[PDB]
Amino acid sequence: IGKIQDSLSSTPSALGKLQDVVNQNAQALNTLVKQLSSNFGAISSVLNDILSRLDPPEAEVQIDRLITGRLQSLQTYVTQQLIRAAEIRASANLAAT
Amino acid sequence: ILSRLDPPEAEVQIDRLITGRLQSLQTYVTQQLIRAAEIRASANLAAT
Amino acid sequence: NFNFNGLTGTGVLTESNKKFLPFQQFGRDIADTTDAVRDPQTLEILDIT
Amino acid sequence: TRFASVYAWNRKRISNCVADYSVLYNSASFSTFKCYGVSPTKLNDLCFTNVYADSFVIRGDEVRQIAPGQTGKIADYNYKLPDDFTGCVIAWNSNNLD
């Protein structure tokens, strides 16, 4: 028992799985929030870029591009989460058995 | 489109083409992901 | 209601005690979002939440 | 009063000065208080007011056989030009009172 206690206290690299599990989600969320700052072919990328600044009969044909460019970014994220949860379930079943 | 045309003439074509071409990639990526996911389970069964 | 840099809108600001360089005008966070501002009326620093 | 050649463009300066564009359109010499299109969408943003006071000349000919993304023809020689295009524009004729 003392041997394994000391070995676990010494070696820090045994928890890579538990570390990367959290790291993946953190990175995915960071990417998702970062994505908001892309122009998607428009002049500007700020959320305010659809708020108080240019005429309707020329800006309605422009805001549509931004709104349709922001949605696939959500679609990919939800698919990624689906796959990750799908494999986590099998891991949990193995652990329970 | 480029060498016989005046330069700034083909936005609405090249943009739609590049968006469409890009869209075709994630489908193949997803298929590969699903197939690899199944293969992992098969390999685990074989190892056991 | 109304306190930012030069006309109309509805926004967000809080109080702070940060130490700033005298020439900087904007304070942004990791998320590329403004989170700290300074005013020339009196040279204290204001934050965002 | 003085409109010289390109070397001596006129200037309004922001110094010891107070009047809105409201005063500027309230006159009879000018007849508009807009540009040709500004409304709640898409370019203008920091908390901020207007345009700065400088004057120059630019060109925009090749637009009809055009869909943007590449290099133009006209706006190069006598004054350097940036690229981004959006916002408000006013231009019409006047040939009566001078």
Short mmCIF file of C-alpha atoms in Angstrom, two decimals:
data_model
loop_
_atom_site.label_atom_id
_atom_site.label_comp_id
_atom_site.label_asym_id
_atom_site.label_seq_id
_atom_site.Cartn_x
_atom_site.Cartn_y
_atom_site.Cartn_z
CA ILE A 1 0.00 0.00 0.00
CA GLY A 2 2.81 2.41 0.83
CA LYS A 3 4.53 1.48 -2.42
CA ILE A 4 1.51 2.38 -4.56
CA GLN A 5 0.86 5.53 -2.53
CA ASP A 6 4.40 6.75 -3.17
CA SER A 7 4.30 5.77 -6.85
CA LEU A 8 1.03 7.63 -7.43
CA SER A 9 2.36 10.65 -5.54
CA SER A 10 5.47 10.63 -7.72
CA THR A 11 4.19 10.00 -11.24
CA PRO A 12 2.07 12.95 -12.49
CA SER A 13 1.42 11.69 -16.03
CA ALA A 14 -1.13 8.97 -15.23
CA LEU A 15 -4.20 11.24 -15.41
CA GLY A 16 -3.92 12.20 -19.08
CA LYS A 17 -7.35 10.81 -19.95
CA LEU A 18 -9.15 12.80 -17.26
CA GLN A 19 -7.16 15.89 -18.23
CA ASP A 20 -7.85 15.71 -21.96
CA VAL A 21 -11.55 15.03 -21.38
CA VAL A 22 -11.92 18.50 -19.83
CA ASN A 23 -9.43 20.07 -22.23
CA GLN A 24 -11.43 19.05 -25.31
CA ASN A 25 -14.62 20.69 -24.05
CA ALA A 26 -12.77 23.83 -22.98
CA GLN A 27 -11.12 24.16 -26.39
CA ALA A 28 -14.40 23.58 -28.22
CA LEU A 29 -16.19 26.26 -26.21
CA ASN A 30 -13.30 28.69 -26.74
CA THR A 31 -13.43 28.11 -30.50
CA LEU A 32 -17.20 28.58 -30.57
CA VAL A 33 -17.09 31.90 -28.73
CA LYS A 34 -14.10 33.06 -30.78
CA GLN A 35 -15.94 32.40 -34.05
CA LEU A 36 -18.19 35.45 -33.53
CA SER A 37 -15.44 37.81 -34.74
CA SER A 38 -15.54 36.72 -38.41
CA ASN A 39 -16.95 38.96 -41.13
CA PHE A 40 -18.30 36.09 -43.30
CA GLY A 41 -17.95 38.31 -46.36
CA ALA A 42 -19.43 41.37 -44.69
CA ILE A 43 -17.42 44.47 -43.86
CA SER A 44 -17.57 43.98 -40.09
CA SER A 45 -18.00 41.12 -37.64
CA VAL A 46 -19.24 42.78 -34.44
CA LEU A 47 -22.68 41.76 -33.16
CA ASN A 48 -23.37 45.50 -33.34
CA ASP A 49 -22.77 45.28 -37.11
CA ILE A 50 -26.48 44.58 -37.54
CA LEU A 51 -27.80 47.22 -35.17
CA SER A 52 -27.65 50.96 -35.87
CA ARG A 53 -25.64 51.86 -38.96
CA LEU A 54 -26.96 51.44 -42.56
CA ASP A 55 -30.09 51.65 -44.74
CA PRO A 56 -32.67 48.84 -45.09
CA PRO A 57 -33.06 48.48 -48.87
CA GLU A 58 -29.33 47.78 -49.23
CA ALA A 59 -28.62 46.23 -45.82
CA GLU A 60 -31.34 43.58 -45.87
CA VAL A 61 -29.43 41.90 -48.72
CA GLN A 62 -26.30 41.99 -46.53
CA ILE A 63 -27.45 40.91 -43.06
CA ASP A 64 -28.81 37.67 -44.53
CA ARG A 65 -25.30 36.56 -45.44
CA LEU A 66 -24.14 37.04 -41.85
CA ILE A 67 -27.14 35.27 -40.33
CA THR A 68 -26.75 32.29 -42.67
CA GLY A 69 -23.01 32.20 -42.03
CA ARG A 70 -23.47 31.97 -38.27
CA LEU A 71 -25.62 28.81 -38.22
CA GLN A 72 -23.39 26.02 -39.56
CA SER A 73 -21.03 26.96 -36.72
CA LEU A 74 -23.75 25.78 -34.32
CA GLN A 75 -24.56 22.71 -36.40
CA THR A 76 -20.98 21.41 -36.35
CA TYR A 77 -20.74 22.01 -32.60
CA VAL A 78 -23.87 20.01 -31.83
CA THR A 79 -22.73 17.14 -34.05
CA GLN A 80 -19.36 17.06 -32.30
CA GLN A 81 -21.03 16.95 -28.89
CA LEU A 82 -23.30 14.14 -30.08
CA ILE A 83 -20.35 11.99 -31.14
CA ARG A 84 -18.41 12.63 -27.94
CA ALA A 85 -21.38 11.72 -25.73
CA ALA A 86 -21.98 8.62 -27.84
CA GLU A 87 -18.53 7.25 -27.08
CA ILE A 88 -18.59 8.37 -23.43
CA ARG A 89 -21.69 6.22 -22.93
CA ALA A 90 -19.86 3.06 -24.03
CA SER A 91 -16.95 3.91 -21.75
CA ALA A 92 -19.37 4.27 -18.83
CA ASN A 93 -21.02 0.93 -19.58
CA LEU A 94 -17.63 -0.78 -19.59
CA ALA A 95 -16.75 0.80 -16.25
CA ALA A 96 -20.04 -0.30 -14.69
CA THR A 97 -19.56 -3.88 -15.87
CA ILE B 1 -12.71 33.62 -65.19
CA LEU B 2 -9.54 35.60 -64.45
CA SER B 3 -7.29 35.97 -67.50
CA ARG B 4 -9.83 37.26 -70.06
CA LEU B 5 -11.99 39.24 -67.63
CA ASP B 6 -11.52 42.58 -65.96
CA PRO B 7 -10.42 41.67 -62.42
CA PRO B 8 -13.16 42.65 -59.97
CA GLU B 9 -15.96 41.00 -61.91
CA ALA B 10 -16.76 37.57 -60.46
CA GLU B 11 -17.61 37.83 -56.78
CA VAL B 12 -21.08 36.25 -56.74
CA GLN B 13 -19.76 33.27 -58.72
CA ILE B 14 -16.50 32.45 -56.96
CA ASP B 15 -17.99 32.99 -53.50
CA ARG B 16 -20.86 30.59 -54.16
CA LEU B 17 -18.44 28.10 -55.71
CA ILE B 18 -16.02 28.20 -52.77
CA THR B 19 -18.84 27.91 -50.23
CA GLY B 20 -20.30 24.93 -52.07
CA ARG B 21 -16.94 23.23 -52.45
CA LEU B 22 -16.14 23.73 -48.77
CA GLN B 23 -19.54 22.35 -47.76
CA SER B 24 -18.70 19.03 -49.42
CA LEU B 25 -15.85 18.30 -46.99
CA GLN B 26 -17.52 17.93 -43.60
CA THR B 27 -19.84 15.24 -44.95
CA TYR B 28 -16.88 13.02 -45.83
CA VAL B 29 -15.26 13.90 -42.50
CA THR B 30 -18.41 12.82 -40.64
CA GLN B 31 -18.56 9.54 -42.55
CA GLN B 32 -14.95 8.81 -41.62
CA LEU B 33 -15.68 9.64 -37.98
CA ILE B 34 -18.65 7.26 -37.81
CA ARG B 35 -16.78 4.43 -39.52
CA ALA B 36 -13.77 4.81 -37.21
CA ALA B 37 -16.09 4.84 -34.20
CA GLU B 38 -17.56 1.49 -35.23
CA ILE B 39 -14.12 0.05 -36.01
CA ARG B 40 -12.97 0.90 -32.49
CA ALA B 41 -15.74 -1.24 -30.98
CA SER B 42 -14.91 -4.09 -33.35
CA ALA B 43 -11.25 -3.92 -32.33
CA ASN B 44 -12.16 -3.94 -28.64
CA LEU B 45 -14.27 -7.07 -29.13
CA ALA B 46 -11.43 -8.77 -31.00
CA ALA B 47 -8.92 -7.89 -28.28
CA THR B 48 -11.19 -9.30 -25.58
CA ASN C 1 -29.04 53.34 -20.07
CA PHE C 2 -26.41 55.89 -21.07
CA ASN C 3 -22.57 55.88 -20.40
CA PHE C 4 -20.03 54.88 -23.22
CA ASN C 5 -17.70 56.88 -25.76
CA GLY C 6 -19.79 59.38 -27.92
CA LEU C 7 -23.53 58.79 -28.65
CA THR C 8 -26.77 56.80 -28.22
CA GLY C 9 -27.36 53.31 -26.84
CA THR C 10 -27.96 50.67 -24.10
CA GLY C 11 -24.88 48.85 -22.76
CA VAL C 12 -22.90 47.56 -19.71
CA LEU C 13 -20.26 48.93 -17.27
CA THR C 14 -18.94 48.26 -13.75
CA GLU C 15 -16.34 49.69 -11.36
CA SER C 16 -12.64 48.82 -11.30
CA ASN C 17 -9.27 49.72 -9.78
CA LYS C 18 -6.87 48.74 -12.57
CA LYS C 19 -3.59 50.53 -13.26
CA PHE C 20 -3.51 51.82 -16.83
CA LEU C 21 -1.01 53.28 -19.24
CA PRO C 22 -1.79 56.95 -19.95
CA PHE C 23 -2.32 56.58 -23.72
CA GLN C 24 -4.47 53.43 -23.91
CA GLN C 25 -8.16 53.97 -24.66
CA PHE C 26 -9.70 50.47 -24.70
CA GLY C 27 -9.50 47.54 -22.34
CA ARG C 28 -10.49 44.18 -23.81
CA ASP C 29 -10.62 40.67 -22.41
CA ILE C 30 -9.61 37.24 -23.72
CA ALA C 31 -12.97 36.93 -25.51
CA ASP C 32 -12.16 40.05 -27.59
CA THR C 33 -14.75 41.93 -25.53
CA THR C 34 -14.39 45.30 -23.82
CA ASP C 35 -14.13 44.87 -20.05
CA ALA C 36 -12.34 47.98 -18.72
CA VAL C 37 -12.73 51.64 -19.66
CA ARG C 38 -11.29 54.97 -18.52
CA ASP C 39 -12.82 58.44 -18.53
CA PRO C 40 -11.22 61.89 -18.89
CA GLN C 41 -13.86 63.63 -16.77
CA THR C 42 -12.07 62.03 -13.83
CA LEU C 43 -9.27 59.59 -14.51
CA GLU C 44 -10.64 56.56 -12.64
CA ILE C 45 -11.14 53.20 -14.36
CA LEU C 46 -14.48 51.47 -15.00
CA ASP C 47 -15.04 47.76 -15.66
CA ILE C 48 -17.69 45.62 -17.41
CA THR C 49 -19.98 42.76 -16.31
CA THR D 1 -14.04 81.34 -51.05
CA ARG D 2 -10.79 79.81 -52.38
CA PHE D 3 -10.80 76.51 -54.31
CA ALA D 4 -7.25 76.11 -55.60
CA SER D 5 -5.69 73.13 -57.39
CA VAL D 6 -5.12 69.71 -55.81
CA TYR D 7 -2.14 71.04 -53.83
CA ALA D 8 -4.27 73.45 -51.76
CA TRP D 9 -7.43 71.58 -50.79
CA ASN D 10 -9.70 73.33 -48.31
CA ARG D 11 -10.07 72.39 -44.65
CA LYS D 12 -12.51 72.73 -41.77
CA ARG D 13 -10.72 72.38 -38.44
CA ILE D 14 -12.08 71.07 -35.14
CA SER D 15 -11.01 73.95 -32.88
CA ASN D 16 -13.04 76.55 -30.95
CA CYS D 17 -16.17 75.48 -32.79
CA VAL D 18 -19.76 74.48 -32.02
CA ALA D 19 -22.60 73.76 -34.47
CA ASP D 20 -24.44 70.60 -35.44
CA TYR D 21 -25.17 69.22 -38.89
CA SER D 22 -28.70 70.33 -37.98
CA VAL D 23 -27.55 73.93 -38.44
CA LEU D 24 -25.81 72.88 -41.66
CA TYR D 25 -28.95 71.41 -43.24
CA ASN D 26 -31.26 74.11 -41.86
CA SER D 27 -29.74 76.48 -44.43
CA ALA D 28 -31.14 76.98 -47.93
CA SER D 29 -27.79 76.44 -49.67
CA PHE D 30 -27.93 72.74 -48.81
CA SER D 31 -31.19 70.79 -48.94
CA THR D 32 -30.56 67.45 -47.19
CA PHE D 33 -29.86 66.13 -43.68
CA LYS D 34 -28.80 62.57 -44.53
CA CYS D 35 -26.72 60.67 -46.94
CA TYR D 36 -28.32 58.35 -49.48
CA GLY D 37 -28.96 55.64 -46.89
CA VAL D 38 -28.14 55.31 -43.20
CA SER D 39 -30.36 53.26 -40.90
CA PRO D 40 -30.06 50.66 -38.12
CA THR D 41 -27.63 48.05 -39.56
CA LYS D 42 -24.10 47.88 -40.56
CA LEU D 43 -20.85 49.97 -40.43
CA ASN D 44 -20.37 52.82 -38.02
CA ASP D 45 -19.31 51.51 -34.69
CA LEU D 46 -17.56 52.93 -31.66
CA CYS D 47 -19.34 55.36 -29.29
CA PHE D 48 -18.58 58.22 -31.36
CA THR D 49 -20.56 60.77 -33.46
CA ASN D 50 -19.86 61.89 -37.04
CA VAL D 51 -17.08 62.18 -39.65
CA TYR D 52 -13.73 64.01 -39.20
CA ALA D 53 -13.01 67.14 -41.26
CA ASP D 54 -10.77 66.45 -44.23
CA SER D 55 -11.40 66.82 -47.97
CA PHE D 56 -10.10 64.81 -50.93
CA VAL D 57 -11.09 63.35 -54.30
CA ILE D 58 -11.66 59.71 -55.28
CA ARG D 59 -12.98 57.80 -58.32
CA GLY D 60 -15.39 54.90 -58.87
CA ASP D 61 -16.00 54.24 -62.58
CA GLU D 62 -15.89 50.47 -63.23
CA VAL D 63 -18.80 49.12 -61.18
CA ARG D 64 -21.34 47.78 -63.67
CA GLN D 65 -19.35 45.03 -65.43
CA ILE D 66 -18.06 44.21 -61.95
CA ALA D 67 -18.61 41.85 -59.03
CA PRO D 68 -15.97 42.75 -56.46
CA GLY D 69 -12.91 40.91 -55.23
CA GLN D 70 -10.03 42.13 -57.39
CA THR D 71 -8.21 45.22 -58.67
CA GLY D 72 -9.75 48.26 -60.34
CA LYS D 73 -8.72 50.93 -62.86
CA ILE D 74 -9.26 54.56 -61.96
CA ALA D 75 -8.74 55.51 -58.30
CA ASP D 76 -4.94 55.44 -58.10
CA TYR D 77 -2.92 58.26 -59.58
CA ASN D 78 -3.15 61.58 -57.74
CA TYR D 79 -4.35 60.37 -54.33
CA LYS D 80 -4.11 57.02 -52.55
CA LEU D 81 -7.36 55.15 -51.85
CA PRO D 82 -8.48 52.44 -49.40
CA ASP D 83 -10.81 49.62 -50.44
CA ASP D 84 -13.76 49.08 -48.06
CA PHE D 85 -17.09 50.25 -49.54
CA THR D 86 -20.22 50.74 -47.41
CA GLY D 87 -22.17 53.60 -45.88
CA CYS D 88 -23.63 56.86 -47.08
CA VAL D 89 -22.99 58.88 -50.24
CA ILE D 90 -24.34 62.21 -51.51
CA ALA D 91 -23.72 63.50 -55.05
CA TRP D 92 -25.80 65.64 -57.40
CA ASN D 93 -25.41 68.69 -59.62
CA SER D 94 -25.49 72.47 -59.05
CA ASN D 95 -25.12 75.08 -61.80
CA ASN D 96 -27.25 78.09 -60.82
CA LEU D 97 -25.99 80.57 -58.21
CA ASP D 98 -22.30 80.99 -59.15
#
